[model samples]
Target: KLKAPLTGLKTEQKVTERRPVAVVVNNHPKARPQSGLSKADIVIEALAEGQITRFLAIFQSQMPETVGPVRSAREYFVTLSNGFDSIFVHHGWSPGAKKQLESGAADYMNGLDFDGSLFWRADFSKPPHNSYTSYDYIKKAAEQKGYKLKQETNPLLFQTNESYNVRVDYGTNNVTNLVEYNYDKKAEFYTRSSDGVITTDRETGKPVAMQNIFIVEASHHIIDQDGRRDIDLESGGKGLLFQHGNVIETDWKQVNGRIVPVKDGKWLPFVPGKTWINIVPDLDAASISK
Candidate 1:
């Protein structure tokens, strides 16, 4: 609207004054008619796929050719109902993923796939199991039965005083535990596997044979003082930590541990010991910027 072409116009010929156009903005933006899956859905679907593949290949011993929504439903139950108890990658949990774990459901895993999945069903009421609590001590006891774990000397991936997400994985049930930290996006860091033994890779400095690793997630926006109203990341608290797409969580309850994502309205909490929670002073949406 600033004239057909100002490219050849001189500085003085260009017009600097412009009047504002008035248009009403509706509170609700209109969605496109052909709206399709966005990056969020894509990431979540991928995360679910990773977990499904790991569970089937390692525990069920059968991998599907292609994954669809129907397939996803079956895979989710199959993974949880699988024999293995848990799969840990991070080194350990912060006091939060620990303290708030049993306090009530919050965003424990980036996104979860329990009974209904609903993603952010973080509450004490909408329990993951009929009455099963994925308690920590029980999980530890069950996991130790299979193999001997040796804590590696490697530092945790995300090091903070309270909570940080470590990147590592381990296995003895069937497949060799490997480090696929943060979906293997980078090679600067490696993971530790706990099986009472330690090995180092030259290319990357990650340890191998891990067990009893940490599953940590943190958010400071909503606390007891905030009344948990602002804690709702998604409609039902879906994609709380890493968003659905960013998650490829190691099987926790499906392997052996029990998980119950409790939600008190907007607040989603985790099972005790199973998760290490953290809350900082300043809040960040936790979205991984492109």
Candidate 2:
């Protein structure tokens, strides 16, 4: 992948990488020449949460007001989620899997329409439950809940056993999205900030701690064992849960494919602050495509 965060100002382009990569399966490792995953892709992303929503709003407004105000705000979350997956997901998923997965995410959003939250639900543990807030909302909500952000020291924003280096730009902006691929949680969550240069959470002179959800390390991998992302504890497989850190998202692309959509009532990220930068086989461009 062409190392991203590589984006300076807002622009669009493709990304590809020639670096050697190893594909591991059930403890078996093999090498292959990359196709889509290796190629450069286009990006039209927002640098911050506000911009993400505002941009969507602008695009929605472009549509005939007859469309009815873009329906739900949660649509933005689905848009971004679908965009990233279709734009990336390196591997093309089976059509059956793609369909199921998309519907699932949409259903989750529909459920959260009540809170009228920004993006996805704020977190899986809260009152309404299931993440619903946009990246901007999470930062604000996290701070209002009281969290301290600084280098190390339990990562007031988010923390697992692994350590997190201060990331100036994780999600929003030109900064490459830092993703924590959690196998145990069966979901990959993305970490983001409005900007990398400074703390956006600053309310007063004192800087506010960032927000976070528990994330698995990027390098760590485990066997699918029975189609579920679980450790074979009883069978003595240990299930292999470990900390993976700083998985850099190199690049992305728009693909015309699909995956089995994942609906609510399924397992999701365990961490409150973390969310997934899912790899999509394809994206469903809502009439008001972002």
Candidate 3:
């Protein structure tokens, strides 16, 4: 038996040498019912521009055949993916993000360059909201681009513990930006809802669920005329950790390029399973209940 690094879950096959793939998923209203999220080991959500949120989903122990509606990349998302040394996947890029990718900041597959081939748009949604990719395409593109396909990942700490329900607001009165999670005690996972709608895989119709829910507060700034943002993921700040049926008020720190919850300088271990991390502008943006 082997343990997956990101999720700390038991697996029958080898996963230690498998390189992870990080995809930037769109969270715009139209991008709802996203593909492949249920299979991700870890999914991180943060504000991109405006009040809209975007997802940085990391896959390793399991791979989805299709994962999208893929969205553009933000600099902060690239930095987050770099921490895992995963192959970064995205549709487009912000100016700063473009510079980072051009400079080889991380191994990446961009829809801007591979559009109709490795990436494609589904007929179900309009442009910008229909772009998608898969694990096979990512692997083929990586092989062609001469990027390494295997790497070791540092695992996060894990322990069995327990949440009932949690909500995170993006500092807005708008319900469209609201995020909610309801714990399923029987399944030992939390089902996610965005903007009051249950989130599920578009193709498989599987609800997005996870064992751990992490909400961290980071400083966000507007850098340009467009609403593109500059999020500070490096600085340690307030954080909330939810598991089983409990919520903990804690602080977060960047340890070995990974943001983790810590109390008295000791890192808190997560329950063995999938994890979802939401980055809010401040601690006040989140609320918890029994």
Candidate 4:
């Protein structure tokens, strides 16, 4: 059995030869019911501006035909994508992010440059929320840009273990920016919900579920009057790992550019399956229950 590097899941196909693709997905209320999240190996969530969060969905083991409501890029998201050496995909970008991307921080495809060609607008959603892209388009764009399509990635540590439900309030209350993971005993996965609604793919209508939920606390600074943030992803801090209907208190550090939960100087292994990581500015923002 071949284990996928990002999720540690067993797969028969060759995953090592294909580079992962990291897409920046929108999290605004209008962007609800995002596409292609269920097929992602890892989804990293962090605030883009104000109380709204954005996703860096990394696909390796599986690729969905459609993914997005593609949003603007952030520098920290670029750093996270660089860890896996994935092709970073996004629409517009924050100023700091644009600066980094222009310097060739990571292999990238921006919708700002290829609006109607590589990306298209769907009629169902309004302007900003209607931008979408498919894997085929991304691949074509990458090939045209001379970006490498193959790269082997180191697998994260994994072992069988056991969750409790989790709630993270990224805003003032549950109504604003709440994220919940309800443990499913039968499926051995956690179904995700945003605010109070279950999150599902827009195209497939598949509910987003995962075997691991990692919540980490990082320093966030408002860099401008627009509330654009400069998040400190490098400095390690408090963290919580939820798996198998249980929660483990831990700390986090950046190992090989990935934010991993560690305890007593050892990195914790994730359960072998999909993982959803939430980055909050404070540990108190997250809570767990039986």
Best by lDDT: 4
Clashes of each: 41, 51, 7, 8
Q: Each model's TM-score?
A: 0.18, 0.20, 0.96, 0.96
- Cα lDDT of model 3 by residue, 200-244, tens digit: 988788787898989999998888777667988888898989988
Give lDDT: candidate 4, residue 154: 81
Ranking by lDDT: 4, 3, 2, 1
Q: Over the stretch 175-274, how does candidate 4's per-residue lDDT look in tens digits? A: 4788899999999889999888999988788798899999999999988787777889999899999999989899999989989899997988998989
For residue 260, what is the lDDT in candidate 4?
82
**What is the model-wide C-alpha lDDT for candidate 4?**
0.90
- In order, the Cα lDDT scores of the candidates are 0.21, 0.22, 0.88, 0.90
Error of 2 at 81 (Å): 12
Off by over 4 Å in 1: 1-163, 168-170, 177-179, 182-290
lDDT of 1 by residue, 13-74 (tens): 12222111100001011110101111000011111111111111110111112111111122
Error (Å) of candidate 3 at residue 137 is 0.7
Model 4 alpha-carbon miss at residue 164, Å: 1.6
* Top of the candidates by TM-score: 4
Compared with the true structure, model 1 gives a TM-score of 0.18
lDDT of 2 by residue, 1-290 (tens): 21221111122223121111111001000011101111111111222222121111111001111110111222222343343222111111223324544665421222222235433332223432122223234234334534321111111112232333322213335524332222222233222233232211111322212122211112112223433121111111101111233322122222221111112422222232212222211121101100
